[PDB]
Design a protein around this nucleic acid. Structure first.
Ligand SMILES: [Mg+2]
Ligand SMILES: [Mg+2]
Ligand SMILES: [Mg+2]
Ligand SMILES: [Mg+2]
Ligand SMILES: [Mg+2]
Ligand SMILES: [Mg+2]
Ligand SMILES: [Mg+2]
Ligand SMILES: [Mg+2]
Ligand SMILES: [Mg+2]
Ligand SMILES: [Mg+2]
Ligand SMILES: [Mg+2]
Ligand SMILES: [Mg+2]
Ligand SMILES: [Mg+2]
Ligand SMILES: [Mg+2]
Ligand SMILES: [Mg+2]
Ligand SMILES: [Mg+2]
Ligand SMILES: [Mg+2]
Ligand SMILES: [Mg+2]
Ligand SMILES: [Mg+2]
Ligand SMILES: [Mg+2]
Ligand SMILES: [Mg+2]
Ligand SMILES: [Mg+2]
Lengths: 191, 139, 109, 195, 148
RNA sequence: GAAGCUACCAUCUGUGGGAUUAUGACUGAACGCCUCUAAGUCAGAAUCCCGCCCAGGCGGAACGAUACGGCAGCGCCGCGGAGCCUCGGUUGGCCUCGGAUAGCCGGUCCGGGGUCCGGUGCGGAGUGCCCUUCGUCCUGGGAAACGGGGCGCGGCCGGAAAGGCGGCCGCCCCCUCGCCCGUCACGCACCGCACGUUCGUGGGGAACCUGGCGCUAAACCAUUCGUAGACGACCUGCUUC
RNA sequence: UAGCGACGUCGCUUUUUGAUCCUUCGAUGUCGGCUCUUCCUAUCAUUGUGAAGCAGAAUUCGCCAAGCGUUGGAUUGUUC
RNA sequence: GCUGCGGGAUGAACCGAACGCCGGGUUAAGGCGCCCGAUGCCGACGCUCAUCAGACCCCAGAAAAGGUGUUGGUUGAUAUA
């Protein structure tokens, strides 16, 4: 019905600095930096306040389908702040009912080599997206920790790893085997 | 971003229409496509004009919403919009366009003759400034 | 010296969709793109100038290969500044897309 | 006597109609940088339309049938030919006035380009509407010179950048000279008649 | 640096290298449909002959399709053959220490005096005294025909 | 039974990239939560396109040779002269990229950041320069030290996607009324009239008189060959060692 | 409601037959078989998929899907 | 049929309109992005996004049923206890 104004405010901590040359948002924090182009949203972004620096997102004369993106923008900024402050760590555990899945890292966790998945001789090589590092965690059996900054990259690499081990021509209910993302959290705690 | 807003007390310029070339005061917004405009001191009556018909300016006046003419003209005179309107780079460009359109044949001839004297000296000085910059950047 | 006429293009004769009227021609004069601007050119003479292989006598000077068809502006056409014209003899169909110079001989303002 | 119309940002039909109407009058039109012509609608939608057009072909002899072009300049040329009366002598003679070209060649890099606002995507389509680039659409179907086109475009852009820097330096020197010679140049006529 | 100079084949090619051969096939002249497209022959009881195509096309393409087998010229076509393995790169008639040394077609297991040209010379071809290339299988083109 | 044709009746070879469909997924609001979707991302195939291969357009490029002999003939530069066919124009605009919820200009500092002007665009194409000039002569004010045109020379190729005009410096036959304002005096003042003024030393073809610098062939036919041929066409040879 | 689904009801097709006789009576050569090209998809198999009363194997129901194949014979003129 | 003409791209029956040869103006039906004359009006309000959009009596295509895709309406029931 062409709503007049739709505004959403996002708070910013003291650790991270955020900047905008336009719809482009750049967040600089303790662990690396993030930058995203929002040229396909068509929404106003303005930071205001000293020592607080709250970011408001404003939409004027938007329909029911256009008023939805003003919250997705704030959610993306929240995810960027969370990843640049604490980071995103996905623990993926592998179910290996009979055949043990042998996962190894190739080059600084940028490449995952999976051997002996359901007894197949095929070697599955999955490369991680830039900025995501994977490792075999200790004090636990058959798990992989994938740590990074950008959530849309960490979860993308996790989904790639999960879909690499997929049963074919067999039952999906039966033959429960493969690496599934068990836990999702941050690298830094107490926040 | 978005340093101009329509509101109760915004003076706007009419780009086209029956009252083209005059300033009005937006009293209130009606149906997100047209707004009531007063323009008491600009010789225009109170009526509804579309948003796309008007062009926003920088000056803002303090009116209560849906105010009368005796209360909007007083604030117009208090803000003193008319005299300060000529002291801007926008009304000056508009008047410049009007004068260029009102040019006559003698005026065009005089302008053409003055261009010969004006542009040539500028060109001969640019030819010296360029060589001066070249000699400066030579070492 | 200098040009003393306005430029106009011959787009076609006055026509419907399945028939033509060669007695009246349509002109697209440069600079006029509105109905309220063509009132200045009403009544102005127009000349379609071309060249042939046999030189013909001219009013001033020796004979020349130049041949001109005269006419004048009758009325306006449409809202896009197009204008109408009627010549002594109908324009040849080869003149479509060419130039007819609109003189300023009949002056009113 | 020529009209050098830029291609990037203009809609296919919205620009082709204007060019087809202006060519029938006699103005020689040259459409430059045709790989940037945008097309309204989804990219997959336009791809499906082009593939449905490709499917159409004479059965008994495909060589003696519909000639499908892969270059975006030739696509724009066929679009303009679809509106021009090409089966008549007038349209045949007008077809040479149009010069569709990919990239900005030497004969046209130095000429200033024109923009028709009646065909610009910014004013034609809503900011939320999807559009497809003719360059990518053509490259996805049998076009091979997109890489060299982009390389030559980068080269000519790096050249025009230096040219504009020189022009801006000349403009700065001109403004400095104008501010320097305040005396001996009154030119009150220029201000009274507003340039 | 190599202008106005000779280039041997051993510098451009090597042993056990998969190679492509471009050439022109054997000219056979005007051939019928059974010889050009290998269309099945009609029975003996047919009139107007046997070695023809019995049906060109249906009633309503209104024309003859380009995919119908027609009698025309066969052979002498520009063809390319892929995946041809090189077996031997040999040369002879090098020096004059031995008055005429060939040592061609002499493997390390044979170790007998022999040459490339067969006993009695090649058929429709002379001597192969120059360095040669030995490819696997058949190759397109007639004898003494240029191939790339 | 030679040679030649021929057989899945013998022998050799038959190859990968992209955007994606179905589908499974990532982030994620609408709708406090959820959701593969509403904006954005990922994988994705005998299907689609192209790669390999087949023929190359009223498609265009690079290079060689470009007519002896005895009077010839044909090119390049500089040229003055006449005539014929064509159809079209009456100043030229020598350029940043890029967005439209953003960008332009100017700049101290450490390609980006900050600050200062402009912003229904005026360092603007509703724009700006050359310009609206009939010509000649005498003589005053402002501007002008580049001079101002080049049948002229040297240095750079400046620019390859379909390139040739422009700038700089040194001289050359010389030049300070070529620009703006004022001033004394003249000229086709054709007697009211059209096709006038322009890139025209326009494009194309046959020759005429004159200067300078250079060139001295190749196709087709006939004949031969057969790796090719219905006839054409196509693959080849000729030297007196 | 994996797979079917009666009593009812809504659609597509001219690969059957039938209804009418609009062109063809100074003639459009009217069955079947052989050879050969192309197209369609309502997919038998093959490529990639979803669901089962899918433990595996073998199967059944759909989705994008016509690129590639869909044979050899006994009797019948036979289509079948 | 016995009937031309302007629109329906095309046409026997549709819509206007009926016919001697011409010049000027206007109009019916229809139309104004280009074919092709005219919206090149600084036209108004609102709906619509399709990986099968839609685009004008006869006329050349479609139903029952369904959609947490949007846009309006009706009857109702809860909520500072
Ligand atoms: Mg199974
Ligand atoms: Mg091809
Ligand atoms: Mg033979
Ligand atoms: Mg018989
Ligand atoms: Mg075979
Ligand atoms: Mg999907
Ligand atoms: Mg019958
Ligand atoms: Mg017959
Ligand atoms: Mg027949
Ligand atoms: Mg097939
Ligand atoms: Mg009768
Ligand atoms: Mg009657
Ligand atoms: Mg009638
Ligand atoms: Mg009709
Ligand atoms: Mg009626
Ligand atoms: Mg009627
Ligand atoms: Mg009449
Ligand atoms: Mg009407
Ligand atoms: Mg028109
Ligand atoms: Mg439908
Ligand atoms: Mg119809
Ligand atoms: Mg019908």
């Amino acid at each position: 019905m062409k709503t007049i104004l739709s505004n959403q405010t996002v708070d910013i901590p003291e650790n991270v600095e955020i900047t905008l040359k336009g719809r482009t948002v750049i967040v600089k924090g303790p662990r690396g930096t993030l930058r995203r182009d929002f040229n396909h949203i068509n929404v106003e972004l303005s930071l205001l306040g000293k020592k607080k620096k709250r970011l408001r997102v404003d939409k004027w004369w938007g329909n029911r389908k256009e008023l939805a993106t003003v919250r997705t923008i704030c959610s993306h900024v929240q995810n960027m702040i969370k990843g640049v402050t604490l980071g995103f760590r996905y623990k993926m555990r592998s179910v290996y009912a009979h055949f043990p899945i042998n996962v190894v890292i190739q080059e600084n966790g940028s490449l995952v080599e999976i051997r002996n998945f359901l007894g197949e001789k095929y070697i599955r090589r999955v490369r991680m997206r830039t900025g995501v590092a994977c490792s075999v965690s200790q004090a636990q059996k058959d798990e992989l920790i994938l740590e990074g900054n950008d959530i849309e990259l960490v979860s993308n690499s996790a989904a790639l790893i999960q879909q690499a081990t997929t049963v074919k021509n067999k039952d999906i209910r039966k033959f429960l085997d493969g690496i599934y993302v068990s836990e999702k959290g941050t690298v830094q705690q107490a926040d | 971003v978005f340093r101009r807003y329509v509101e109760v007390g915004r003076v706007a310029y009419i780009s086209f229409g029956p009252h083209a070339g005059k300033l009005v005061a937006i009293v209130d917004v009606i149906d997100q496509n047209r707004a009531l405009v007063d323009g008491p001191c600009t010789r225009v009556r109170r009526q509804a004009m579309p948003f796309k018909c008007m062009q926003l300016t920088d000056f803002i006046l303090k009116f209560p919403h849906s105010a009368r003419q005796k209360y909007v003209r007083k604030a117009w005179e208090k803000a003193d919009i008319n005299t300060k309107w000529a002291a801007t780079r926008w009304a000056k460009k508009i008047d410049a366009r009007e004068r260029k359109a009102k040019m006559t044949d003698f005026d065009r001839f005089k302008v053409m003759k003055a261009k010969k004297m004006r542009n040539r000296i500028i060109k001969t000085e640019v030819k010296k400034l360029q060589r001066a910059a070249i000699l400066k950047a030579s070492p | 010296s200098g040009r003393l006429w306005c430029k106009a293009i011959f787009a076609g004769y006055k026509r419907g969709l399945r028939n033509q009227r060669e007695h009246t021609a349509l002109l697209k004069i440069e600079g006029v793109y509105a109905r309220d601007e063509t009132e200045f050119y009403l009544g102005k003479r127009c000349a379609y100038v071309y060249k042939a292989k046999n030189n013909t006598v001219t009013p001033g000077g020796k004979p020349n290969k130049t041949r001109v068809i005269w006419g004048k502006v009758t009325r306006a056409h449409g809202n896009s500044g197009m204008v109408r014209a009627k010549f002594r003899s109908n324009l040849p169909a080869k003149a479509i897309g060419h130039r007819i110079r609109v003189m300023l001989y009949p002056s009113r303002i | 006597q020529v009209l050098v119309l830029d291609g990037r940002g203009h809609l296919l039909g919205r620009l082709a109609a204007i060019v087809a109407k202006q060519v029938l009058l006699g103005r020689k039109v040259v459409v430059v940088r045709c790989e940037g012509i945008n097309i309204s609608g989804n990219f997959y939608r336009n791809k499906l339309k082009y593939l449905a057009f490709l499917r159409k072909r004479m059965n008994t002899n495909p060589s003696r049938g519909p000639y499908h072009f892969r270059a975006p300049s030739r696509i724009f040329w066929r679009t303009v030919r679809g509106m021009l009366p090409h089966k008549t002598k007038r349209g045949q003679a007008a077809l040479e006035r149009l010069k569709v070209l990919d990239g900005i060649p030497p004969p046209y890099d130095k000429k200033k380009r024109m923009v028709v606002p009646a065909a610009l995507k910014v004013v034609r389509l809503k900011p939320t509407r999807k559009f497809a680039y003719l360059g990518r659409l053509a490259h996805e179907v049998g076009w091979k010179y997109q890489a060299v086109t982009a390389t030559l475009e980068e080269k000519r852009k790096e050249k025009a950048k230096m040219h504009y820097r020189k022009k801006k330096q000349i403009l700065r020197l001109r403004k400095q000279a104008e501010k320097n010679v305040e005396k001996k140049i009154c030119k009150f006529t220029e201000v009274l008649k507003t340039n | 640096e190599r202008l106005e100079q000779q280039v041997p084949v051993n510098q451009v090619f090597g042993q056990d290298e998969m190679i492509d051969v471009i050439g022109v096939t054997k000219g056979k002249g005007y051939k019928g449909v059974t010889s050009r497209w290998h269309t099945k022959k009609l029975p003996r009881k047919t009139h107007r002959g046997l070695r023809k195509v019995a049906c060109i096309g249906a009633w309503h393409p209104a024309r003859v399709a380009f995919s119908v087998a027609r009698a025309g010229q066969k052979g002498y076509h520009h063809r390319t053959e892929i995946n041809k393995k090189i077996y031997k790169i040999g040369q002879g008639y090098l020096i004059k220490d031995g008055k005429l040394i060939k040592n061609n077609a002499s493997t390390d297991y044979d170790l007998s005096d022999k040459s490339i040209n067969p006993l009695g010379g090649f058929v429709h071809y002379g001597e192969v005294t120059n360095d040669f290339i030995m490819l696997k299988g058949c190759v397109v083109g007639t004898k003494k025909r240029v191939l790339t």
